[PDB]
Amino acid sequence: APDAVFGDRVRRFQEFLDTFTSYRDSVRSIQVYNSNNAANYNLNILPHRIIISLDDLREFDRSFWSGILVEPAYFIPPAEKALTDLADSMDDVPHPNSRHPWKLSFKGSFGAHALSPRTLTAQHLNKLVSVEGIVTKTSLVRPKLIRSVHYAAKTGRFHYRDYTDATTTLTTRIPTPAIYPTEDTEGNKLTTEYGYSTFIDHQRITVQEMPEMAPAGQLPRSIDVILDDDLVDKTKPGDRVNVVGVFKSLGAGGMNQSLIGFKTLILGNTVYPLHARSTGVAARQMLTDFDIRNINKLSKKKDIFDILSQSLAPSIYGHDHIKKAILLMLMGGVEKNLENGSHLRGDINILMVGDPSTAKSQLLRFVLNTASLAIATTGRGSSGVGLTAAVTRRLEAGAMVLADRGVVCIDEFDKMTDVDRVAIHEVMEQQTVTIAKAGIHTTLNARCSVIAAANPVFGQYDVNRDPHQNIALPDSLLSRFDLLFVVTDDINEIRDRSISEHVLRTHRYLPPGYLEGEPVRERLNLSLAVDHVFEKFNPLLIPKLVTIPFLRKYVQYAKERVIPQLTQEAINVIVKNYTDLRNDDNTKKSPITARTLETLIRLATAHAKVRLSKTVNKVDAKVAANLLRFALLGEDI
Amino acid sequence: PLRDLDSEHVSKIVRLSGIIISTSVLSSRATYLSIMCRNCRHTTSITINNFNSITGNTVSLPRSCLSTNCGPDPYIIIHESSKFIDQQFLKLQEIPELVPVGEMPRNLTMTCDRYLTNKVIPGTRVTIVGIYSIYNSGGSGVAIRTPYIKILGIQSDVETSSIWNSVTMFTEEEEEEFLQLSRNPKLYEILTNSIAPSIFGNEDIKKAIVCLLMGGSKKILPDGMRLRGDINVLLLGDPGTAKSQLLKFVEKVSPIAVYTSGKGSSAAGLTASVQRDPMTREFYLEGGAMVLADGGVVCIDEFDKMRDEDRVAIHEAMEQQTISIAKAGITTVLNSRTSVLAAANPIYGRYDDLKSPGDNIDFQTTILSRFDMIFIVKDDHNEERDISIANHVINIHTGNANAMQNQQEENGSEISIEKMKRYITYCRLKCAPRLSPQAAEKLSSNFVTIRKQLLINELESTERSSIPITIRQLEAIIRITESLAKLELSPIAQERHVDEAIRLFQASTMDAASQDPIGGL
Amino acid sequence: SFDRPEIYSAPVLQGESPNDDDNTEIIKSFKNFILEFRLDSQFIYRDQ
Amino acid sequence: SEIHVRISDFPTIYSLRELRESNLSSLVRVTGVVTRRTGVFPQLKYVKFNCLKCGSILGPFFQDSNEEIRISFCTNCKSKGPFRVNGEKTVYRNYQRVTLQEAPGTVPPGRLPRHREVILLADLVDVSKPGEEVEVTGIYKNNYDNAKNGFPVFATIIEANSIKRREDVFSWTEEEEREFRKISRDRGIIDKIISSMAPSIYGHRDIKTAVACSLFGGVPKNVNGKHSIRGDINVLLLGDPGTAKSQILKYVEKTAHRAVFATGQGASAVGLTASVRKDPITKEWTLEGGALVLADKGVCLIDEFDKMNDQDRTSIHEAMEQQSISISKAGIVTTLQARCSIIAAANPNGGRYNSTLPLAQNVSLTEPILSR
Numbered sequence A: 001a002p003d004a005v006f007g008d009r010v011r012r013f014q015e016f017l018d019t020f021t022s023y024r025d026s027v028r029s030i031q032v033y034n035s036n037n038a039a040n041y042n043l044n045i046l047p048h049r050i051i052i053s054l055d056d057l058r059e060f061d062r063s064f065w066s067g068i069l070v071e072p073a074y075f076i077p078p079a080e081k082a083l084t085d086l087a088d089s090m091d092d093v094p095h096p097n098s099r100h101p102w103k104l105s106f107k108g109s110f111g112a113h114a115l116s117p118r119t120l121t122a123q124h125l126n127k128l129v130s131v132e133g134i135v136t137k138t139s140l141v142r143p144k145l146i147r148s149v150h151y152a153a154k155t156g157r158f159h160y161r162d163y164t165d166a167t168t169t170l171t172t173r174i175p176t177p178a179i180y181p182t183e184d185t186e187g188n189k190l191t192t193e194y195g196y197s198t199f200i201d202h203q204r205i206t207v208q209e210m211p212e213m214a215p216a217g218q219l220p221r222s223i224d225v226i227l228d229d230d231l232v233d234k235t236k237p238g239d240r241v242n243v244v245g246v247f248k249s250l251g252a253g254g255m256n257q258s259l260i261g262f263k264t265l266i267l268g269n270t271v272y273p274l275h276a277r278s279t280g281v282a283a284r285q286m287l288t289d290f291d292i293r294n295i296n297k298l299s300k301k302k303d304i305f306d307i308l309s310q311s312l313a314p315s316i317y318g319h320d321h322i323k324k325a326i327l328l329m330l331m332g333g334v335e336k337n338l339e340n341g342s343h344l345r346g347d348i349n350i351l352m353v354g355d356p357s358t359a360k361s362q363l364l365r366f367v368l369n370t371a372s373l374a375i376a377t378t379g380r381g382s383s384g385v386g387l388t389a390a391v392t393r394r395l396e397a398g399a400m401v402l403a404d405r406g407v408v409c410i411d412e413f414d415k416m417t418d419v420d421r422v423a424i425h426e427v428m429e430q431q432t433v434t435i436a437k438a439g440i441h442t443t444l445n446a447r448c449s450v451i452a453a454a455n456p457v458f459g460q461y462d463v464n465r466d467p468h469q470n471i472a473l474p475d476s477l478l479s480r481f482d483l484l485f486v487v488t489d490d491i492n493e494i495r496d497r498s499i500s501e502h503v504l505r506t507h508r509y510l511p512p513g514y515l516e517g518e519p520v521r522e523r524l525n526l527s528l529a530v531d532h533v534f535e536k537f538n539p540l541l542i543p544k545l546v547t548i549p550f551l552r553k554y555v556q557y558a559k560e561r562v563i564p565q566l567t568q569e570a571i572n573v574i575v576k577n578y579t580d581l582r583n584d585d586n587t588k589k590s591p592i593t594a595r596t597l598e599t600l601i602r603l604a605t606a607h608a609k610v611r612l613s614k615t616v617n618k619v620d621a622k623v624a625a626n627l628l629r630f631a632l633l634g635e636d637i
Numbered sequence B: 001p002l003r004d005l006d007s008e009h010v011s012k013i014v015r016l017s018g019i020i021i022s023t024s025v026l027s028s029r030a031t032y033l034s035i036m037c038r039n040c041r042h043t044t045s046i047t048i049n050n051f052n053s054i055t056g057n058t059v060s061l062p063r064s065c066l067s068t069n070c071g072p073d074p075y076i077i078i079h080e081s082s083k084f085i086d087q088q089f090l091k092l093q094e095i096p097e098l099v100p101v102g103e104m105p106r107n108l109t110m111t112c113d114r115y116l117t118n119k120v121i122p123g124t125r126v127t128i129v130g131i132y133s134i135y136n137s138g139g140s141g142v143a144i145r146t147p148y149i150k151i152l153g154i155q156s157d158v159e160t161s162s163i164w165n166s167v168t169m170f171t172e173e174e175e176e177e178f179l180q181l182s183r184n185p186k187l188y189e190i191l192t193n194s195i196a197p198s199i200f201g202n203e204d205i206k207k208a209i210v211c212l213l214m215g216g217s218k219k220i221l222p223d224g225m226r227l228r229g230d231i232n233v234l235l236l237g238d239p240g241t242a243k244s245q246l247l248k249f250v251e252k253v254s255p256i257a258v259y260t261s262g263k264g265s266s267a268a269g270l271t272a273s274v275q276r277d278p279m280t281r282e283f284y285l286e287g288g289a290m291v292l293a294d295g296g297v298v299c300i301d302e303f304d305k306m307r308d309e310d311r312v313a314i315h316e317a318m319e320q321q322t323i324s325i326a327k328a329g330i331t332t333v334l335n336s337r338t339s340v341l342a343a344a345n346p347i348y349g350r351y352d353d354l355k356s357p358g359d360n361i362d363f364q365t366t367i368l369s370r371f372d373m374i375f376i377v378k379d380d381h382n383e384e385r386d387i388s389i390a391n392h393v394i395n396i397h398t399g400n401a402n403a404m405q406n407q408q409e410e411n412g413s414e415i416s417i418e419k420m421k422r423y424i425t426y427c428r429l430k431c432a433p434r435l436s437p438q439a440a441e442k443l444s445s446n447f448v449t450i451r452k453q454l455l456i457n458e459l460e461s462t463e464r465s466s467i468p469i470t471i472r473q474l475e476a477i478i479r480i481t482e483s484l485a486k487l488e489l490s491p492i493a494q495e496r497h498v499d500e501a502i503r504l505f506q507a508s509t510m511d512a513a514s515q516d517p518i519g520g521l
Numbered sequence C: 001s002f003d004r005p006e007i008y009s010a011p012v013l014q015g016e017s018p019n020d021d022d023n024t025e026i027i028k029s030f031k032n033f034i035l036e037f038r039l040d041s042q043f044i045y046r047d048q
Numbered sequence D: 001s002e003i004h005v006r007i008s009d010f011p012t013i014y015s016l017r018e019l020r021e022s023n024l025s026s027l028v029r030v031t032g033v034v035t036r037r038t039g040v041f042p043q044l045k046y047v048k049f050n051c052l053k054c055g056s057i058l059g060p061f062f063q064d065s066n067e068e069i070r071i072s073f074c075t076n077c078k079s080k081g082p083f084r085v086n087g088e089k090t091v092y093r094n095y096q097r098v099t100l101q102e103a104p105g106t107v108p109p110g111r112l113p114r115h116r117e118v119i120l121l122a123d124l125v126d127v128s129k130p131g132e133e134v135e136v137t138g139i140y141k142n143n144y145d146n147a148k149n150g151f152p153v154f155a156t157i158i159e160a161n162s163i164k165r166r167e168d169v170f171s172w173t174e175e176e177e178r179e180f181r182k183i184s185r186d187r188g189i190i191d192k193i194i195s196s197m198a199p200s201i202y203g204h205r206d207i208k209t210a211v212a213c214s215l216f217g218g219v220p221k222n223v224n225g226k227h228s229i230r231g232d233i234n235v236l237l238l239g240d241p242g243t244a245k246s247q248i249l250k251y252v253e254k255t256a257h258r259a260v261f262a263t264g265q266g267a268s269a270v271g272l273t274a275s276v277r278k279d280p281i282t283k284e285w286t287l288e289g290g291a292l293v294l295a296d297k298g299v300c301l302i303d304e305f306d307k308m309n310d311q312d313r314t315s316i317h318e319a320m321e322q323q324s325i326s327i328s329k330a331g332i333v334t335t336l337q338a339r340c341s342i343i344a345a346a347n348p349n350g351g352r353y354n355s356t357l358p359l360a361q362n363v364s365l366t367e368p369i370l371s372r
Ligand SMILES: Nc1ncnc2c1ncn2[C@@H]1O[C@H](COP(=O)(O)OP(=O)(O)OP(O)(O)=S)[C@@H](O)[C@H]1O
Pocket: B198, B199, B200, B201, B237, B238, B239, B240, B241, B242, B243, B244, B245, B246, B301, B343, B344, B345, B389, B392, B393, D229, D367, D368, D371
């Protein structure tokens, strides 16, 4: 039976949708997208879901906003009905072959409802809450029968029955346990018609307080979240997540005479995978047309490589070719997948062996902070079980499996066991992890670029000795590292005063919105995995330095929209340089193998990607070989 | 006592002490629920304002329609119009100190509700006022019942602190007292003399302790390049030189502090220990001194005797103040913004004046680079000092002279550990000084001078010095200068702070480098 | 989400001796009485 | 409410292996060592049942150890429906189960010791610790509750009337206090106490002096809450085999109040290390303080201190340095108190003491532990 208050709220939300035109634009775009590939194929179908900004709702109608936040069961169904009515009103051109219920998702500032699994108590029940946590368990995506269609052969007629549970609606119904129809009303045997029955995907994930904010030494708190038909498979275990949903109570909690307390869970409305450092979530960024224009504008510059090289770690003094190599690894080459099935690696590995305090770990931490997807590990702090996969009858991804299509920053690389070393041997060239353990023969993808830091045998790189004795690493392992940089802390007066002036200038830095003696606050930077190009603060005083967010945008653009093709004019340089490096006797820091030809190719491709060029020209090969010759010998030609 | 609860205490208010060993997850209990009949639409409400503390549920839904046939239990709960409260199950236990040698320690189930939930954590020593009550569920028995406690109040004692158990809120007069104490021109001496007044003859070490407790100012560069502000101090010395006692005092006086060994405590870890959950088998941070003491200091005794699994972890958590856990399924960078005060013994029992500080120590030489200031506490066998130390130590032992003279000296020349701890908290939470440009230039000149002299000493020799002056050492002198400036709540570190930090760096890691045959002239 | 399993039978063998009191023997004898009874050379009950 | 009668000096003393069906429902007097005790639980004695139809509290109905009682008759409304025991108005009595196992000395050769379950009711609870040899007088009866055995077989219990130790201890009276204060005034008392220790251990007079000093101990001192000094005397006994070192440890366990005996390897009565351990039968976790925690204000006697695990070594070292045990396990983060005096017994490194070598390299343990 119709409710006057329900209709009043429906028309109020219709007024809200009319006021903010972005929601008709979103619904219209979704409908035209669905119709266009429906007619095209007689890709994927976008869900009937709209992101609603709670700030705009508060601006429009504060009580509707407070009603949704505090009494969602009475305000969300009317708003969803209004959205569905609006969508069916604009649906003048129906999809080929009210109706099509549209769901709502919420975003914005939740205030006191933005909680965690620890702070989510029983006085938040029946409220729209945003819970931030870590996904620890993801159940199987199971179909749920919401409508069963049967066939009666004697009458030749198709019947159906709709099913309802306590979690499909925000309000409580009268429970109607309608049985599965095994026969008609008048005795005819029914045959279930699979493919005409309706099954809805259902998942139940567990969100636990994030380790970065959970109290140390205390047992963590968890909360159940239920996802239905479009939020399933939106996250994976170990993901940082922000789930917006209604904190519901279900069952009777032992009152109904046939539990210790009422069964509580979150009916998920929105799932946002969050980006935290050293996690398995990549960093999607929004690239406006202005950002792309600036990226192309800077790519037109000749010295853009240098501009990108110095802007990586201005705080670190020097380490300029190391920064060039780090930028090239951030871009990386393009992997080759030949038709027969073979794989050519397109990821660049870097090793930095050096004396104490030459900033190898700060250069690792910077890469961890700025990379799209980076996992930080330490030698012997993570084993092969912790680096590669692990069998739990089920597999748990390790450091280098979560970092697939990403970067692995390994500090204290020398303090790594040989059992880990063999797994690392497999991961670096073939980019795969073969388990073959306890009846689980699986080949996980570990297409990751490894950057590592190491110390010499005696703790100080002796220039009198040779590198092979100063490294104490297997030669086969050192071959996998595309670029091996030996950094030595030479005491020279010019660079001594220059590095000290830099260190002090960096220490004498103030944020734009801070006082002289105000302790700088620090948050954990839980970015959402979806305004000037250059940097005001320049530790060096000189070319221009771009901001780290803009550098990340540039790296993302070049990494996702540029796939350079090798050219003969680059091949001549690459082949000549490889032949010289193989045959010339120079007492190289690292050996020269066919892997050296491919690090030449990969670095040339990466530098071509830096310039946004779709073809690797001669200059790219020359600069790649230049960096390689520096890395092998120390030349400055 | 928990073992003295007979059957005469049943359904009565009892006060009993113990330790919490378990805190269950909060469960929702209906305090007001709307109900509606199934084969009707009869709306009713059941209010639960009392009897919320019981293992069972004394009040259930009606077995009849209450509108007077509909059937048995025809009511369903309208969950969007009902009200719920929190409940928690705690597990009290008699303290393990006062337990019979050969018997199980006795535990007792407790239930709390509403505002008595999430008040204590496991391991907290508490005083529980409650109702000693009964529920039916301690195995084979007739007419026996399971006792428990309905908690009416929890009185936690002074327990372990954390970065979550921090006030950060000063009463108005307390800020004024600290601020008056801050202009005190002899603040450096009053705070130095308050560092273990009982330990004798370690003024430079006490100044280093003061600087470590203050620490430098942190920087968050636009690159995300974090520069560390905490200070790490190492004390290599002869046995019996007070190194541990100054670690224990630093543990006592710091707001948040953890005192451990190289191998850890009896069962407590030392770094981030990710472990499977006791019931849900889900990865969680079991503990570790470096994550438990986040935001404060850790006093690592016997730093030389430490495993390699803890080696790399502490090496990471001193420069980047972050422990990078990466296991099969869990990967996280845990904040470990902790100052490290380490005490170590020479490989031979006494410090060998002949040999360098390196090769006279068990651990790696380059670990000496990670520490900001290294104090070689040699023992001098001169009798003047022996007699003075013996007289001081006797004054400690039933002489009662040091206690009285410290209470007398507290009036204008010493500060109590509570007041000094709160002052440390205020200084860390309110001040973060910078360097004046002239101070920075003179720091650079000083560092260049030290490094050039090290180069001169190393050029003529063959091997390298055990204690090297690296860029980390420059960044440390900066931290000491900023700590000295923050001592007096100075927003800017002037020349005098730089000079004092320079003197401290000559006292330690430069006098420590003096014994180096290559680091010396 | 499956249907109702069916149960069905079929005669294969002679079972135990038809007993005279069995409801199925009684039904058979009534059926024979209806079909075979003759009054003045007329199947009166069949025709009726 | 009532007086309980404790029958004592029963003439017929049985053994747990001698109990047969002829002793059922009769009064027996067995003897044995207590091996387990199951807490103290309330048991219904005067049951008042609440009527769920009226809200009426029916009067006290005496319940005994035979079986639970039930009420089906109301008075105000004469309902026979659900009747619930009212816990608030019901009266309870103490109940405890004690496992009584035959003393191993009295068991005939080749036979395994036999056990019974003794039920202690409302006055005998918590009077017989495990390991105590007691004489239980009681009623030998059948615990009624058959198909696992294939036979109608019943378990038996002994409902104890009176329980007593067959053969407080450290308590003193005013006359005994005066005797102490007078015997102290005599000269040469220190030597008398030294000679009193270990009266079946020949010589070893320095060992006995050290044992007496540790048994009496010093006094802990805090200057202002800023400097702390332990008031316990840790004594090491470095000896060759057959030097009676174990006997001077068992004598200290004899004479000391709050004395806990542990070993580096062997009988693991106590583990020397605090741990949160989940008991596999009772389903509940327990925080076991180490042997140094149990003897918080007494003495910890370690045998085989030369040979210990790294865990035990770390526990002992850090409880001697800080006088506390820090544990962060299973969500429990706490620092227990271990202000114990440690008496350790060790064997030299190799088998015999070498006078030519210093003590540091004559035994496995190293500088830090020996200093304490
Ligand atoms: N200068 C001093 N003033 C006062 N007490 C002192 C002094 N030096 C040592 N002590 C006392 O000596 C005792 C033992 O000193 P510790 O603090 O254990 O020495 P330590 O050098 O840390 O020993 P290690 O290296 O840990 S074995 C303590 O009770 C101190 O109070």
